[PDB]
Symmetry: C11
Subunit: 124 residues, 11 copies
């Protein structure tokens, strides 16, 4: 699928404040920092979602409805008529080109008709 | 098939307002937002379809009827006559070109007639 | 076959007014729209076919008869005489070219006569 | 065979007035149109064949007789003498060219005499 | 994943003050040096972490909350509309280009339709 | 064989006045036309052969006798002496060229001595 | 690992004062020379290590502590924000480029769709 | 063998006055023509051979005797001395060139040391 | 290993005063010459080794001690800090380049997605 | 072997006065001509060999003795000293070049580390 | 081995005065000529070897002793110090180059990630 949104960027605590085996502090502070980060993030995202989510959903639902009706019932039939004319053109175009092109490429194919070889193998 | 309409763009709620394991709000708001979006979309598309669909179908059915009659009963026989003349031309064109081209390419094919080699293999 | 007419453009109702899982109206309107489209198309194509088909068939049958007689009984024997002369020319042309060309390409073939190699493989 | 006439162009009724599953008229008219086309074609070709075929056959038989006698009994022996002289020239031409060419191409063949490699494979 | 932080740089004592079999001092000094290095590193990192970690976590949690809300609920729907228009353009663009391009590349494909060869193998 | 005459051009009745399944006349006229063509061809070729064949055969037999005696007993020994001198020249030419050429091409062969790879396969 | 220190230079006695089977002195002098070299090297390296090692270890431990704190807690979050913006740009960039590029490369792929060949093998 | 005379040109009756299945005269004339040709050729070649063969054989035997003595006992030892000097030159030439060339080509060989791949297969 | 001394030059008596099967003197002189050469070589190398070896060993042991201390305890930590900065730069550099480069190369990969072929084999 | 004399030129009676199946004289004359040729050749070569062979052998034996002594006992030791100096130069030359060259070619090797493919096969 | 003397030039009697099956003299003279050649060669080489061999052996033994002492005990340690500095330079050089080069070559590797194909085989 070409029109699929690519995956998000990992942002978890251990994926953004990342340490190796050589880097350490006190053990108990890790949980405190992680809890602070996670709860701040959640508490600030949730209120915005609750306050502003419905209106955007309504607006974009209505907009997509109109867009999809237009596409399905005015664009596709026109494209089909266009395709009819394209086929009519191809009927005249393709054979005429093949006439002049095919003999040359059939002739050039004779370069690969003389292969011969000998081989010997060993193993242990 | 060349003249086939390509697949649509995914637009479902979870495919347009997409989140990862790091992004969350309150659980119950998800269903509310999804229901609002889906029902708005359906209720706005259905009325337009009901009101305006039949006339477009009638018009394009009539148009396609005329187009297809023209194509089937005036274009294809003409193309067949054209093809007859094309074959007549090929009869004279192809052998004359092959005469001058084939000897050269048969001669050049001799470059691949001297392959020899030796090999040894091991495994464990 | 070079002179074969390419396949038609799909034009069925579900192949021109095409929808996905995300796009829906009322269920019953689909059958109404499909019936309107199909019956309009058929009723408009059938009358034209009935009224105008025979004359075109007669005319093109007569035309093709004349064309094919001309091709079979005046063009092909002439092409055969032409081919006789072409063979006579080739008898003199091909050996003379091969004389000067073959030694060079036989000599160049010696580039591929010194292949050697060693290998070892593993698997699990 | 180089001097063989290429196959004809398909011209049958269903191969020139061609329809798909989407294109239809009344059922009975198809047989009427096909019969009209086929019988017109046959009735117009047969009379011309009967009236004019024998004279063309006689003329071209006589012409081909003369042509083939000329080719068999005056051209081929001359070509054979020409070939004798060609062989005499090759005797002097080929070894002299091979003298100067072969050492270089034998030397260049040493580029492919140092292949070595290692591999490992897995499967499941 | 494109947006993943690359692994750290190894900095352990034996990985930064590295010696070979040819380089040696007294045995007991190795432990003294290693202990000094490790404990200095830990004692200086831990205090900074304890003193300054929470505020940075809070700030970046709040910042990421705002950023992610913006991305999820204002950018993606706009991109989806953009994709709708892109599909509409492709419907007209692709077949027209394929019409003129495909015959040429189908014709050029005939260069690989004349392969022949002979081989002989030996083993021991 | 380089000096072999290439095969004739097919000229039989059904190979020069050729028809397909779509092209037909009355059945009985086919045999009449074929008989006329074949018998005219044979009756015109046979008399010419009978009247003029022996003299050409005698003349070309005598001519070829003289030509072959000249070739066998004056050209080939001279070519053998020429070959002796050619070998004498090669003795001095080839080693001197190989001296300067071989080291370079042995050196360039080292480009293919570092191949390594890993693979994994699946099947069902 | 990109940031790993490469292996040392071999410096052992037999690896720096190296002889072959053709080069020999008295047997007993080899041990004397080896002992002198090894003990001088060890006695001069050990005192320097003992005298100067601890201070360098302390200094670099403190320095690395500060550096790693800076990297972990000020650089990585900024890079993550940068990555968010990069993803937003890619959403608009990639599909638009693929629209114009893919048809051409799909068309060019038709060059490899006409392969045919025949082979014969022998063994002993 | 480089100095071997290439095969003669076929000149038999059926190989120079050649006909196909489409070309025929009276049956009995074929044997008459063949006998005339063959006996004329033989009767004219045999007398010349008998009259003039011995003197040419004597002359060329004497000439080849002198030529071969010269080659065997004056040219080959001189070529051997020349070869001695050539070897002396190679001793100095080859190692010096390999010194400057080999490192570069060993270095360039590293381009083929990073191959990896995955595959899947199906059959029926 | 890059910093390993390459093998010596063979200098044994039979490897420097080398003869073939065609070159011979009296048998007993070979042993005399070999003994003279070998004993002169050994007697002249041994005294120099005994007289001058220890001082060079002492000097180079001391020198290498100082060099290795400098390398291990002043260069490597600095290189590690440099590597830290290099990683910090890469974090910003690599994703930005991949953004603009990957779509193009993914698109160009479509040239190899249309392979088809047919084959036939024989053996005996 | 580079300094080996290439094989002689075939000069036997049937290999220099060569005939095919189409060329014949009286049977008995063949033996007469062959005997004359062979005996003349032998009788003229043998006397020259007997009269002049010993002196050339003596002269060239003496000459080769002097040449080979010079080569074995004055050229080869000098070449060995030259080789010693060459090795000394290589010790300094090769690592320095590899330093600057290897990283680039290791980097360029990454072009072949992304191979993937799918296949399907059929047989009968 | 690079510094190995290449094999001698064959000089035996039958390898320098070489004849084929077509070239012959009296049988008994062959042994006389061979004996003369061989004994002259041996008798002239042996006296020179006996008279002049020892002094050259002594001189070159002494010379090689001095040369090898110099190489082993003054050149190799210096080269080792040089190698230490070379490694120090590489530590800084290689990662910096890999930083800018690797992303580009990883990106270009995506050209080989789209292979697909179909095949059919036959045998008899």
């Amino acid at each position: 699928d070409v029109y699929r949104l690519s995956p998000h960027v990992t942002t978890g605590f251990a994926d953004t404040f990342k340490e190796s085996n050589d880097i350490m502090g006190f053990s108990f502070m890790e949980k405190v920092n992680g809890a602070i980060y996670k709860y701040t993030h959640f508490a600030f995202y949730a209120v915005l979602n609750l306050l502003l989510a419905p209106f955007i959903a309504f607006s974009f639902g209505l907009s997509f409805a109109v867009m999809h009706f237009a596409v399905v019932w005015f664009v596709q039939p026109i494209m089909k008529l266009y395709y009819v004319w394209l086929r009519v053109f191809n009927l005249a175009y393709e054979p005429a080109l093949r006439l002049v092109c095919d003999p040359i490429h059939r002739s050039i194919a004779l370069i690969l008709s003389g292969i011969k070889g000998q081989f010997k193998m060993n193993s242990s």
